[PDB]
């Protein structure tokens, strides 16, 4: 029943700002306000409690303030660790509600990716598939253009990207393009190249190999 | 408009002398003369032992004792003037404890609220 | 040393019920109180319940009072939570926290699960398989060699990859799986290492699909 709204959806930040995120419930929590951070694929970890009170452990550059409605969660000075999903809990009368989370992504400097190519292995091929596998390594910005090309004929149709969430240690993001026929298509072609382009790049760059080598 | 609970989060007292716990509360059907029951527990909230329990009937401001640990425990406040503050007496070193604020209306089932945070009362020797 | 141990996964057919776990260890169970909190992917978290586990009382989210239902078991020191008639809106992760001290001014969450993942789906489950990304003068980059897996084909999500049965994590990207055109998925994993360990050190990553009951551990070697 208590709206609990977080400020701002999301944000980008670099490495030693000073950093601000607030949020506003719809009732006096009576300051029983607690803040956690979440990373994709974890499990959420308490940074501050009773508005202002920091768990043991958790770095001093995190401060937290408020009272009544309004409250905020400070970072003095951004380390890359500190990126993630930061969401408010009143926990003052049931039920508990949450925020809807702020999104703290970090701004560093442009980084160009390092191209791997991999090509099938045997184990898969005697399955009847091949899979080639294009990897774009620890690159920012987040915006990469992958374009695979089979004995230089442009590919669409036929490969799928996952990109990681942004990395911890140093803010980049890895980006993987799997091309995926079958071993007869496989076969049927020689040069299996995939070609890059990114900000950090002063040209395109491929990577490429020959189905014998 | 608005059930809520006013209760300090300390208090503190020496050992054979009273404490006071305040309690003040908000509700719904702000002119509710209905019966009434006043509820005090210990040591968790919604689980912990009741030490001290009273009624009020329809139309009355007397809060009938139904329970009061080692009758030690008494209302001060005015449960019709949403005040259930509670006095200790008498206070023992194991009276050290935190306590939960709780009052029952008669109605519906969501008629009814306690202290989701409570007051630890702090006895010196 | 408290440890609060999900199941990871949980594969359940609309219309059924599932019980899900939550183990504790290295604490004295019924002197805390356990919360259950739900986090549908790409959204929010919302509380589900809390529960005294030293006297099962339970408070609940009216939300949920009609589907959930928290339990304790004290003689295994196990908190549980059913989720009755499943749809695919109930698929979901599903944590179960523990409070620091709960009732005082100063409580809070002191430790929180590993969340279990439930799929509701009428489908079987199926284990993936696991192919090798061999390092190769193709995957070198200043002196460091890039190798992995491939793990294609299972359903539903997650699977758990590690490399030399967790002695590996400095330099590991494993990737959000995608979805095929079939409804499985793949992903891959991948770590950078020396160039010059290739001749002597071993890489296999570990892959672990628990609703198949899939363990298998691929050894990467170069060509």
Same mark, same amino acid.
């Given at each position: #029943? ?12 670099? *490495? ?53 409605? #309004? ?17 408010? *809990?009143?926990?003052?009368? =049931? ?39 294009? *990897? ?78 | ?84 503050? *509670? ?16 009052? !029952?209306?008669?109605?519906? /089932? ?16 | ?87 695919? !809106? ?84 494993? =990737?959000?799986? /995608? ?45």
């Amino acid at each position: #029943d208590i709206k609990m709204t977080q400020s701002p959806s999301s944000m980008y930040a670099s *490495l030693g700002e000073r950093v601000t995120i607030t949020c506003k419930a719809s009732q006096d929590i009576n300051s029983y306000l607690s803040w956690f951070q979440q990373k994709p694929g974890k499990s959420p970890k308490t940074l501050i409690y009773r508005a202002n009170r920091l768990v043991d452990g958790v770095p001093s550059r995190f401060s937290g303030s408020g009272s009544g409605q #309004d409250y905020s969660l400070t970072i003095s000075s951004l380390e890359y660790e500190d990126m993630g999903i930061y969401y408010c *809990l009143q926990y003052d009368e =049931f039920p508990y509600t949450f925020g809807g989370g702020t999104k703290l992504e970090i701004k560093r400097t442009v980084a160009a990716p390092s191209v791997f190519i991999f090509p099938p292995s045997d184990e898969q091929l005697k399955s009847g598939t091949a899979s080639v596998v294009c *990897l774009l390594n620890n690159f920012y910005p987040r915006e990469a253009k992958v374009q695979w090309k089979v004995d230089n004929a442009l590919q669409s149709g036929n490969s799928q990207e996952s990109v990681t969430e942004q990395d911890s240690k140093d803010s980049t993001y890895s980006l993987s393009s799997t091309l995926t026929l079958s071993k007869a298509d496989y076969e049927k072609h020689k040069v299996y190249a995939c070609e890059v382009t990114h900000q950090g790049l002063s040209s395109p760059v491929t990577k490429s190999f020959n189905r014998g080598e | 408009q608005r059930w809520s609970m006013q209760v300090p989060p300390e208090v503190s007292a020496e050992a054979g002398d009273a404490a006071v716990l305040p309690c003040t509360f908000t509700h719904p059907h702000r002119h509710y003369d209905g019966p009434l029951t006043a509820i005090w527990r210990a040591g968790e909230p919604y689980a912990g032992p009741q030490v001290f329990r009273c009624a009020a009937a329809r139309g009355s401001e007397l809060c009938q004792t139904a329970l009061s640990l080692h009758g030690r425990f008494r209302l001060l406040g005015n449960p019709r003037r949403n005040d259930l503050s *509670l006095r200790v007496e008498r206070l023992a070193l194991a009276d050290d404890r935190r306590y939960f604020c709780r009052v !029952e209306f008669a109605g519906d /089932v969501h008629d009814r609220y306690e202290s989701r945070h409570g007051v630890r009362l702090h006895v010196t020797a | 040393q408290v440890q609060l141990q999900q199941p990871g996964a949980e594969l359940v057919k609309p219309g059924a019920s599932v019980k899900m776990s939550c183990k504790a260890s290295g604490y004295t169970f019924t002197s805390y109180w356990i919360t259950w909190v739900i986090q549908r992917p790409g959204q929010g978290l919302e509380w589900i319940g809390d529960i005294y586990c030293g006297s099962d009382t339970m408070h609940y989210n009216e939300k949920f009072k009609n589907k959930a239902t928290l339990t304790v078991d004290t003689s295994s020191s196990t908190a549980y939570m059913q989720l009755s008639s499943l749809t695919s !809106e109930d698929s979901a992760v599903y944590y179960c926290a523990r409070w620091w001290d709960y009732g005082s001014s100063y409580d809070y969450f002191d430790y929180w699960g590993q969340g279990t993942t439930l799929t509701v789906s009428s489908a079987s489950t199926k284990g993936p398989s696991v192919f090798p990304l061999a390092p190769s003068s193709k995957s070198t980059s200043g002196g460091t060699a890039a190798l992995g897996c491939l793990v294609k084909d299972y359903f539903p999500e997650p699977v758990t990859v590690s490399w030399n049965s967790g002695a590996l994590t400095s330099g590991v990207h494993t =990737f959000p799986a /995608v979805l095929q055109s079939s409804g499985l998925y793949s992903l891959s994993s991948v770590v950078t290492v020396p160039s010059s360990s290739l001749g002597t050190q071993t890489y296999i990553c570990n892959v672990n699909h628990k609703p198949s009951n899939t363990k298998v551990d691929k050894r990467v070697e170069p060509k």
